[PDB]
Design a protein around this ligand. Structure first.
Ligand SMILES: [Ca+2]
Ligand SMILES: [Ca+2]
Ligand SMILES: [Ca+2]
Ligand SMILES: [Ca+2]
Ligand SMILES: [Ca+2]
Ligand SMILES: [Ca+2]
Lengths: 164, 181, 164, 164, 164, 181
């Protein structure tokens, strides 16, 4: 097995939510987790055909004053095809968190460990372990700058040279 | 003992100075002030190539040695600003002194990189070579420096930010000499 | 571990030699082996700081009719700084080959397995294993399309995300 | 110890045979194997007094179109003093080859492993393992560029610093 | 490991200091120790790419009448890049000696044992173990003829054919 | 953990550098040349107040410490001249840095003083305080220097004399700081 194990942390999302626009249910972050989204895994998948997610954790690291109001709910839907973006869908899934805008949280999700495809295809279920959604809970008072990072570990296989 | 034409030199301990010195300490490698609004995303707060000259006592100690090995290297991002400050920072130690890539992804790719809010302090425990480095400068700086510490803003800072970047260093100096700049 | 083992085979050089211009001693190919010269290794070194060349082979694949006169001498100088481009300098290197223009051959070079640097710098000796030089021997009668391929194997360390 | 083991592969001869001049029995190559004839071994014998040939092979690499008629006979006379340049004398030697002008071959000679002298002297038998003779067989139709390569391995002894 | 171990003694420097010109601090000998400086190691490095210094000792053998005045200080700076040529730099280093002009001394220096490069490059620290400096201490009275010899042992690697 | 108005500082190892360093070495504290006839009796060949600045590596090490104690101090008079030279020298280490008495009797009164001919080398094993001295300079130099080494001619020198005065020093440095001239 000429399988390359690669791991690291990288920012999957950067969002700037201005004060007053963060109504309840607003989709701050919506990211289908594909290797192209990750910076280093981007090149790793550019030089490989298939990857398997061994470790996957998300870290919501919002940077805002401690006196800000409102909060966020973050969750990882294990189905890339699912398009339901609501509090109910996030609360149903496992690993989801809800916390105030100044708090930093970790989503430990339920993801498939099968061998997925680095490139895109007709079926998203063969290419991505899922998607991550970060929604507003309430109304924010200050300008929020939220960075969603991801500790990931993957196994790569089937060498190639892909294109964006 | 007869009188000779010339007597042999009696200098004995010449060229026998101390070879190894372990020197430890902690010093401020950088200090930055950011007025409100300047700290846009990607702004380079701190860019410091870790060299013996950067650390004053280590600089004076390296002026009398040829080689040094970094036994221990850790950094502290200590921002002295209130908790009402918005924005954050990313800090990381690039093990390549030559690389001048100043982005969030480049820093996050390195081991030990920290992403924090401006009212949170972090410790960077980086990856550094244990090989012998040269105290004096040369053409290639990959032989003289373990790397560079980089600190960027992640978001716009609401208030003024005072950030001090500290370093705990432990080094072993070897090959005694007398260097001059 | 941080160490990942990659292997592959890619074309380091593509040259076209018109009829009659291939005089003895002419330099068909002069390629400094760097990770950017190899596509998959290009991406791999873009996501790493250090690399060590475990295995290195070259394949001279000249595409010309059997009625082509002359030949080539191919070698791998294990010194990236060395600029000698004579027959004796190539032949002194281990694994150098001499062959007719219509006869593909393989170079098995000898080099020191030291941990190199993926990104460029002041000293080229810390970043490249060496150079491949391909010279003409005699005169070619036809036009020769020469593809110089490299079968490589590397060990990568110190993860990062570099830029070209 | 004083004994150092060196090996290498270098071109002992480069010859050009015009069309029609390669009559049967013509002497294309007649090279007395001496350390000066081999560059790296040239320097090695310049810094030593005695050398013993542990391994010796030759590669005839004629660079001509496939439509070339005639051929060559290549052999290694293990007597530097011998001046016989006929087909039977070469064929009697161990490892002699006969091949078409467009077919590269290898000679595996037989010789006595005696400790020789790097520097020249009155008796050539104490300084050289022998000679390589390459003769024409039949008539060549095209022009043939012949490179005679030698893969050698020596043991060197009695350090000194000689002059040419 | 096809590493050739070679050793011997050879004169690195020959200096003729006339009477009255040997003022204190005068640089009698300044030699960056490279294999090209050594006679036999010159050819050895001409036929090799890399070398590692296993044993290195210098022997100051000045030839002058015993009634001459003044002396010398000799020392090996382990940094080839260092350009400080004074008594202080020599006294700081280890292995340095100071003795009268009629005395013969041995400098046993502190040198790197890493694999250095026979050829020259941008960085001198990858090509030379250091430099040797021999300075005057006082004023000489007679004409001094000082020969600096070196017992050296090296390991050579990566065959090639270099140029001066 | 609730959000406070301000969080406590997390700087922990501050003000915890190394306190004691033992540094040894040997250096030329003086070098003198005497043309024929100049070295009359009582001529002061060498007058060197032993201070950390006089010893280069010790000077750089004392720039990062406050106090130093001389554990070992010995001197070598090494005159590099032939045996046909007439005259001699007297060498001695005055334990008082302030005293500027330059005579044969003053030197001979001290312990360890040596009287030799110009073609003979001597070792001065002096009497020095083991108390803590100040690395930096001050009003009173009795608190910063163990003493001064003095070297005079005893008789007229017939030939030119080259004399080098060396010192083996071992010191213990304490009270870390960062001194500036
Ligand atoms: Ca694909
Ligand atoms: Ca230096
Ligand atoms: Ca790099
Ligand atoms: Ca000879
Ligand atoms: Ca070279
Ligand atoms: Ca002070």
């Amino acid at each position: 097995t000429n399988d390359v194990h690669l791991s690291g942390m990288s920012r999957i999302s950067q969002a700037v939510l201005p004060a007053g626009t963060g109504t309840d249910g607003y989709v701050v972050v919506d990211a289908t987790i594909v290797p192209d989204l990750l910076p280093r895994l981007g090149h790793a998948a550019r030089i490989f055909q298939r990857y398997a997610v061994e470790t996957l954790e998300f870290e919501i690291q919002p940077m805002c004053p401690a006196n800000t109001g409102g909060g966020y709910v973050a969750g990882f839907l294990p189905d890339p095809t699912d398009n339901d973006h609501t509090f109910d869908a996030l609360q149903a899934t496992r690993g989801a968190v809800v916390a105030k805008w100044w708090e930093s949280r970790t989503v430990r999700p339920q993801y498939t460990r099968t061998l997925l495809w680095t490139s895109s295809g007709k079926e998203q279920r063969l290419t991505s372990p899922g998607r991550l959604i970060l929604l507003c809970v309430g109304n924010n008072t200050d300008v929020v700058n939220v960075s969603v990072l991801c500790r990931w570990s993957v196994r790569l296989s089937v060498p190639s040279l892909e294109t964006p």
